[PDB]
Design an enzyme around this catalytic site. Structure first.
Site, PDB file in Angstrom:
ATOM      1  CE1 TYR A  32       0.766  -1.606   4.251  1.00 57.56           C
ATOM      2  CE2 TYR A  32       0.934   0.767   4.486  1.00 57.56           C
ATOM      3  CZ  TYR A  32       1.197  -0.505   4.962  1.00 57.56           C
ATOM      4  OH  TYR A  32       1.847  -0.670   6.160  1.00 57.56           O
ATOM      5  N   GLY A  33       2.128   1.174   0.360  1.00 58.61           N
ATOM      6  CA  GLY A  33       3.017   2.322   0.421  1.00 58.61           C
ATOM      7  C   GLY A  33       3.554   2.583   1.810  1.00 58.61           C
ATOM      8  CE  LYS A  52      -3.043   4.370   1.964  1.00 60.53           C
ATOM      9  NZ  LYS A  52      -3.796   3.099   1.880  1.00 60.53           N
ATOM     10  CG  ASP A 146      -5.279  -8.395   1.307  1.00 62.64           C
ATOM     11  OD1 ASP A 146      -5.226  -9.636   1.445  1.00 62.64           O
ATOM     12  OD2 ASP A 146      -4.268  -7.665   1.245  1.00 62.64           O
TER      13      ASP A 146
HETATM   14  N1  LIG Z   1      -3.584   1.448   3.705  1.00 67.51           N
HETATM   15  C1  LIG Z   1      -3.221   0.638   4.427  1.00 67.51           C
HETATM   16  C2  LIG Z   1      -2.771  -0.402   5.302  1.00 67.51           C
HETATM   17  C3  LIG Z   1      -2.150  -0.302   6.522  1.00 67.51           C
HETATM   18  C4  LIG Z   1      -1.830  -1.616   6.962  1.00 67.51           C
HETATM   19  C5  LIG Z   1      -0.983  -2.148   8.087  1.00 67.51           C
HETATM   20  O1  LIG Z   1      -0.298  -3.132   7.844  1.00 67.51           O
HETATM   21  N2  LIG Z   1      -0.941  -1.511   9.272  1.00 67.51           N
HETATM   22  C6  LIG Z   1      -0.048  -1.913  10.370  1.00 67.51           C
HETATM   23  C7  LIG Z   1       0.956  -0.802  10.690  1.00 67.51           C
HETATM   24  C8  LIG Z   1       0.267   0.557  10.883  1.00 67.51           C
HETATM   25  C9  LIG Z   1      -0.702   0.858   9.735  1.00 67.51           C
HETATM   26  C10 LIG Z   1      -1.518   2.123   9.865  1.00 67.51           C
HETATM   27  C11 LIG Z   1      -1.572   2.858  11.035  1.00 67.51           C
HETATM   28  C12 LIG Z   1      -2.440   3.927  11.049  1.00 67.51           C
HETATM   29  N3  LIG Z   1      -3.221   4.261  10.013  1.00 67.51           N
HETATM   30  C13 LIG Z   1      -3.093   3.480   8.925  1.00 67.51           C
HETATM   31  N4  LIG Z   1      -3.943   3.713   7.884  1.00 67.51           N
HETATM   32  C14 LIG Z   1      -4.888   4.833   7.823  1.00 67.51           C
HETATM   33  C15 LIG Z   1      -5.655   4.566   6.535  1.00 67.51           C
HETATM   34  C16 LIG Z   1      -4.695   3.743   5.708  1.00 67.51           C
HETATM   35  F1  LIG Z   1      -3.723   4.596   5.148  1.00 67.51           F
HETATM   36  C17 LIG Z   1      -4.013   2.870   6.691  1.00 67.51           C
HETATM   37  N5  LIG Z   1      -2.248   2.436   8.783  1.00 67.51           N
HETATM   38  C18 LIG Z   1      -1.694  -0.299   9.588  1.00 67.51           C
HETATM   39  C19 LIG Z   1      -2.307  -2.478   5.987  1.00 67.51           C
HETATM   40  N6  LIG Z   1      -2.864  -1.733   4.991  1.00 67.51           N
END
Ligand SMILES: N#Cc1cc(C(=O)N2CCC[C@H](c3ccnc(N4CC[C@@H](F)C4)n3)C2)c[nH]1
Lengths: 336, 266
Positions: A32-33, A52, A146
């Site tokens: 996802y980046g 993100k 997913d």
């Molecule tokens: N997109 C996406 C995504 C994230 C993850 C993942 O492995 N994780 C674990 C590590 C912290 C990541 C996190 C924390 C706070 N916000 C978000 N966000 C806010 C919306 C989206 F950007 C994810 N992500 C979550 C899988 N897919």
């Protein structure tokens, strides 16, 4: 392009690196980046944001899907997109979101660590909220594709305390499969609602025991070691239990590689009994209806929400932590 | 995906525009082109997008979405801001990604744009298609943001199918009603009315044309029949403009009258 139109848009264009402080604060990294815990440079806020940068340059199918869907979706259990930044200079796309201090991967890991060294209905509240958000997506004909603990975020201290937020709507289509439904492992050519329902069942079993129910060791749409792990827990599906298993593309590969008798004493009952979960409980019966081998014999998210388990004491709460001081530490940063 | 979400969609909340607001913004371009020339140009680029979409073997919903992005862009911006000749294939390319069709390759997108304008639109374009994939990808960043990232577009084909199924006249009316739905894209109807209303208007004209009595079925609908009559008038007007317009003989001149982009200081 018109020069006057170009300079005017350039001057109006909000830049991600001018609006937020996020360098060094990366909390996640994957397909996802990059996700960052950001803070506003103008200070007229003090709030924490999830920022993100989408993987790759330009509008990928994945970036396209997340932007198009998040732009239309409005549900308290689905993460809300607030802003989109289009970094013209490097073709990078950034997405602004509220910051969820917690996620189900980090909470489940915390419990797993504690065993080696969950208030009343925290598991139940997490389930009802996961189901509620997926139900809204499925009502709008949107498949997650997913679902897994890492993309099931949970808000920390603040006005949305202990609320589930489903994340990552960018799994667009044209090494771990612990949450992939058995039909996908047999070459099913489409994603369906029941695939997300199977995934919710794996999370429910992981919330009830702390272990990934289909935990298997590390291209081909058929995965032997994972299918074997599914049968070690569920057992081998009888002909009557999944009649269209014959219709799966990898059915004769499954017949060649596996034998019904290998998994003769294998059942979800025996697995949950070992992990101290009563098979006569309303939590077991619901879990079993989500973890059905046959996608057509699998319950719906609407039907799961109406289960009597949610009527049994304690009721699900809007705050999964239910007042209780969140023992979970805040999310730790990464280095790239 | 986002099927019955119309009344809560970005499409309804932001992209169902006020006709006076739309005409007011158009005045910047009505200095260079008459109202008639502006319509004729909007019919022309609708036909270019359709030909581009056919070349790429894309579904009608992709073409219809591409047309709506194009219409939306020039509803707020002037024909000089971005060249519509670069904008039209950019719209096709993005619409295929949104609609989960795929990412059209650099070579294939540019070659479809080149071949379509050369073979089918040579009366309006004497020169070969001048843009490269870097220009299309650039224009895409602009189109994406200057639409507020509103990518999910509702069209009248989905309600129309439900309507003729209810009527039980799918065999008799759907081929014509569907055709009339395609024609409504030559007009601003998609920017003014909900898709189900354009579908009812298209089904009505189809009923008139084939002499099928649907007065009772239409009376049994809980709809603003004045709004439907407004849309019908636009559809009837379009056919008289169709008869009185020869794009092959008038479009090279209408394209020359059009405003062009001011170049950077030199
Ligand atoms: N997109 C996406 C995504 C994230 C993850 C993942 O492995 N994780 C674990 C590590 C912290 C990541 C996190 C924390 C706070 N916000 C978000 N966000 C806010 C919306 C989206 F950007 C994810 N992500 C979550 C899988 N897919």
């Amino acid at each position: 392009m018109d020069y006057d139109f170009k300079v005017k848009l350039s001057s109006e264009r909000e830049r991600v690196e001018d609006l937020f402080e996020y360098e060094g604060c990366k909390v996640g990294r994957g397909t996802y980046g990059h996700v960052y815990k950001a803070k506003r440079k103008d200070g007229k806020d003090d709030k924490d944001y999830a920022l993100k940068q989408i993987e790759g340059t330009g509008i990928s199918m994945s970036a396209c899907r997340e932007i198009a869907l998040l732009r239309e979706l409005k549900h308290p259990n689905v993460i809300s997109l607030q802003k989109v930044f289009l970094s013209h200079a490097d073709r990078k796309v950034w997405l602004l979101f509220d910051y969820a201090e917690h996620d189900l991967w980090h909470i489940i890991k915390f419990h797993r660590a504690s065993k080696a060294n969950l208030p009343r209905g925290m598991v139940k509240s997490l389930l009802y909220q996961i189901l509620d958000g997926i139900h809204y997506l499925h009502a709008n004909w949107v498949l997650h594709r997913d679902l897994k603990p890492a993309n099931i975020l949970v808000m920390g201290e603040g006005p949305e305390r202990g609320r589930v937020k489903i994340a990552d709507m960018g799994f667009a289509r044209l090494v771990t499969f612990w949450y992939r439904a058995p039909e996908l492992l047999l070459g099913a050519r489409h994603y369906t609602k029941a695939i997300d329902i199977w995934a919710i069942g794996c999370i429910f079993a992981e919330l009830l025991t702390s272990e990934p129910i289909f935990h298997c060791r590390q291209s081909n749409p058929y995965h032997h070691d994972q299918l074997d792990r599914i049968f070690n827990v569920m057992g081998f599906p009888a002909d009557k239990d999944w009649e269209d298993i014959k219709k799966m593309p990898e059915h004769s590969t499954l017949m060649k590689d596996f034998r019904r008798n290998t998994y003769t004493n294998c059942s979800l009952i025996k697995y949950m009994e070992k992990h101290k979960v009563k098979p006569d409980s309303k939590a077991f019966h619901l879990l079993q209806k989500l973890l059905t081998m046959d996608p057509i014999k699998r319950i719906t998210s609407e039907q799961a929400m109406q289960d009597p388990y949610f009527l049994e004491d304690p009721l699900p709460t809007s705050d999964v932590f239910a007042g209780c001081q969140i023992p979970y530490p805040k999310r730790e940063f990464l280095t790239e | 995906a986002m099927a019955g979400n119309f009344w809560q969609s970005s499409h309804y909340l932001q992209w169902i525009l006020d006709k006076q607001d739309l005409l007011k913004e158009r005045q910047k371009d009505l200095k260079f082109l008459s109202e008639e020339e502006y319509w004729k140009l909007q019919i022309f680029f609708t036909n270019v997008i359709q030909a581009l979409g056919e070349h790429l073997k894309l579904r009608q919903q992709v073409i219809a979405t591409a047309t709506v992005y194009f219409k939306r862009f020039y509803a707020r911006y002037s024909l000089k801001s971005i060249d519509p000749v670069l904008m039209a294939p950019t719209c096709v390319f993005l619409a295929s990604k949104v609609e989960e069709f795929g990412v059209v390759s650099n070579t294939r997108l540019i070659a479809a744009a080149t071949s379509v304008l050369k073979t089918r639109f040579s009366y309006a374009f004497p020169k070969e298609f001048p843009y490269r994939m870097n220009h299309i990808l650039e224009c895409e960043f602009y189109l994406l943001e200057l639409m507020d990232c509103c990518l999910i577009v509702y069209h009248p084909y989905r309600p129309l199918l439900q309507y003729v199924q209810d009527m039980g006249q799918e065999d008799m009316l759907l081929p014509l009603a569907w055709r009339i739905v395609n024609d409504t894209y030559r007009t601003d109807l998609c920017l003014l009315y909900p898709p189900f209303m354009i579908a009812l208007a298209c089904l009505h004209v189809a009923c008139v044309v084939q002499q099928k009595d649907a007065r009772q079925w239409f009376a049994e609908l809980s709809v603003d029949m004045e709004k439907i009559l407004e849309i019908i008038r636009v559809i009837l007007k379009l056919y008289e403009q169709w008869k009185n317009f020869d794009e092959r003989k008038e479009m090279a001149t209408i394209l020359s009258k059009m405003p062009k982009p001011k170049p950077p200081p030199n």
